[PDB]
Amino acid sequence: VLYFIGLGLYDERDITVKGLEIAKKCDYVFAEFYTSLMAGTTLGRIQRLIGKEIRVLSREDVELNFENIVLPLAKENDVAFLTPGDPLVATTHAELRIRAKRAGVESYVIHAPSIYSAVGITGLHIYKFGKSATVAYPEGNWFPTSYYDVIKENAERGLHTLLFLDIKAEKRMYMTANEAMELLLKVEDMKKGGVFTDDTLVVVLARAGSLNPTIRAGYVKDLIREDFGDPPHILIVPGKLHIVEAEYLVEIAGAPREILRVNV
Amino acid sequence: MVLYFIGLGLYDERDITVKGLEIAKKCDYVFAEFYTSLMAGTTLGRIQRLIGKEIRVLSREDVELNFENIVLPLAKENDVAFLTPGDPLVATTHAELRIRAKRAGVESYVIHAPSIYSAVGITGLHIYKFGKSATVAYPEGNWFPTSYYDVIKENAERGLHTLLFLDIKAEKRMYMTANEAMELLLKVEDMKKGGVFTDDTLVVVLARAGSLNPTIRAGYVKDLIREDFGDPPHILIVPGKLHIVEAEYLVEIAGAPREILRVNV
Numbered sequence: 219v220l221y222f223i224g225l226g227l228y229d230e231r232d233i234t235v236k237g238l239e240i241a242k243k244c245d246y247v248f249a250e251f252y253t254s255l256m257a258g259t260t261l262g263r264i265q266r267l268i269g270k271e272i273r274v275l276s277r278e279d280v281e282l283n284f285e286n287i288v289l290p291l292a293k294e295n296d297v298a299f300l301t302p303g304d305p306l307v308a309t310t311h312a313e314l315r316i317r318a319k320r321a322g323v324e325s326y327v328i329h330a331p332s333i334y335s336a337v338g339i340t341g342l343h344i345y346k347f348g349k350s351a352t353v354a355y356p357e358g359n360w361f362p363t364s365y366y367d368v369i370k371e372n373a374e375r376g377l378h379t380l381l382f383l384d385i386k387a388e389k390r391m392y393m394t395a396n397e398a399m400e401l402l403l404k405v406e407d408m409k410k411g412g413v414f415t416d417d418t419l420v421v422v423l424a425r426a427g428s429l430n431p432t433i434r435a436g437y438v439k440d441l442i443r444e445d446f447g448d449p450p451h452i453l454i455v456p457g458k459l460h461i462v463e464a465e466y467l468v469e470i471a472g473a474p475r476e477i478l479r480v481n482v
Numbered sequence: 483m484v485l486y487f488i489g490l491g492l493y494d495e496r497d498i499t500v501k502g503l504e505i506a507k508k509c510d511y512v513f514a515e516f517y518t519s520l521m522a523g524t525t526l527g528r529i530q531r532l533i534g535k536e537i538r539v540l541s542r543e544d545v546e547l548n549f550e551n552i553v554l555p556l557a558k559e560n561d562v563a564f565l566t567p568g569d570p571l572v573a574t575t576h577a578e579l580r581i582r583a584k585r586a587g588v589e590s591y592v593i594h595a596p597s598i599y600s601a602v603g604i605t606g607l608h609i610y611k612f613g614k615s616a617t618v619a620y621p622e623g624n625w626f627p628t629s630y631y632d633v634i635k636e637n638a639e640r641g642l643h644t645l646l647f648l649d650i651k652a653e654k655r656m657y658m659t660a661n662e663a664m665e666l667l668l669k670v671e672d673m674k675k676g677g678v679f680t681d682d683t684l685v686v687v688l689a690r691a692g693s694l695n696p697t698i699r700a701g702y703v704k705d706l707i708r709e710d711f712g713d714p715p716h717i718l719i720v721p722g723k724l725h726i727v728e729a730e731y732l733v734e735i736a737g738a739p740r741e742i743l744r745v746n747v
């Protein structure tokens with residue numbers, strides 16, 4: 219069979235006990251580290267924890283040849299496929315389960331802490347998050363802007379917007395919340411929808427999963443050049459705040475106490 | 483001087499992270515709450531045996547009213563663990579406890595674990611397409627909440643999926659089933675008539691996420707409303723329009739009818 223096992227948010231210990239015990243017993247172990255960055259560990263530390271050699275796959279290996287590289291072995295052995303965070307969150311790995319089934323290979327999923335739910339540490343109510351988006355790096359003359367519309371739609375409904383940030387693993391490029399803010403300000407100048415400006419309140423979460431992640435809230439004008447530490451980072455554009463959310467942002471995320479006076 | 487909020491994960495005692503288990507084992511005192519949710523695939527005894535030290539369970543009142551008198555005093559001179567189902571602070575009331583810790587001069591750290599909020603990715607539905615979430619609560623006497631119906635309406639109108647947390651009477655271990663949630667939604671439809679939830683609505687049910695063998699089913703209300711989805715917990719999802727890849731996963735992994743490919747995509 220094939221096991222999709224999440225490794226978690228930051229280091230090798232973010233794997234669930236369930237996932238660790240299953241990985242330890244698999245005959246072959248594959249993994250990908252292009253969908254996210256685990257800033258607090260190394261391939262070696264992960265390999266030593268599970269006691270197995272890990273065959274790292276590239277995006278092309280997975281998207282073009284998963285059925286030729288992984289499935290053949292999964293047909294005669296217990297195989298594990300490890301991924302940062304949760305394997306089925308903000309990835310297309312669910313597609314691999316379809317491929318596995320069509321190949322007659324049984325698959326199982328072992329979850330792990332995900333950034334999608336870890337944002338609860340920002341004090342923003344999880345149920346208030348609306349549609350999510352990804353801020354992608356412009357490439358050549360191609361400049362992605364769809365994420366701007368997502369914020370607009372959510373904000374109109376008073377919902378928070380989670381913005382996954384881009385990652386180019388092969389080039390070791392990890393988009394910072396600062397770069398995301400800069401990009402959003404440029405899109406605002408092109409669309410002028412009054413969606414993201416210097417006065418917009420934002421929240422930054424960096425290195426969730428670590429013991430001391432950076433949790434900061436404030437206006438773009440003040441946070442755009444602030445050092446949030448090493449990647450990975452995620453950016454959030456809150457919608458209409460409840461007083462309790464504002465209180466946490468002020469007390470824990472260092473937000474301006476003025477956000478306490480929620481305009482009703 | 484340190485308080486650790488540690489997530490227990492989705493279903494059984496092995497759903498805690500290695501980090502959470504190792505930290506709990508080194509704490510002087512271990513507390514836990516089982517009112518925001520429950521760990522259906524295990525027991526207090528099994529969690530306690532895995533950690534190796536006594537776990538003091540706190541009631542909703544103990545936490546909401548007396549967290550600062552029961553937990554924080556000990557955290558002042560010792561390392562204290564506070565275990566919670568799922569991922570800490572997904573439950574909306576968790577966060578404020580960190581402010582109480584701050585007020586008491588106690589450092590607090592969060593050790594994450596899987597949450598049903600993120601585990602729904604196993605339904606094959608794209609995470610980014612989930613909109614606002616809602617909870618379907620059991621009506622009681624003169625209280626018949628229906629806001630969750632409006633949440634589905636607003637999400638679906640924008641092509642977004644709706645995650646519906648189902649009610650859980652923790653103290654009595656009573657879990658609302660997907661069937662009961664569907665029945666309530668049909669009743670709300672009868673009262674609002676917005677054409678939001680009917681026998682022809684496509685729904686997805688995820689039961690016992692975290693287990694190696696969760697029940698993942700998708701189909702129309704008319705066919706699923708009386709289906710046995712197995713033991714708790716259940717959540718219900720009302721998807722918005724589907725990407726063909728989402729529909730294929732529902733058909734091939736969740737047993738959805740082929741009709742969803744020509745009706746819901």
Ligand SMILES: Nc1ncnc2c1ncn2[C@@H]1O[C@H](CSCC[C@H](N)C(=O)O)[C@@H](O)[C@H]1O
Nearest residue numbers: 227254303304307332333383425426450451
């Ligand atoms: N520990 C962490 N801290 C902050 N952001 C994180 C993070 N882990 C992932 N992200 C964010 O999410 C993006 C990857 S998207 C893949 C997410 C993963 N499956 C999960 O379940 O978490 C990163 O580029 C970053 O923007």
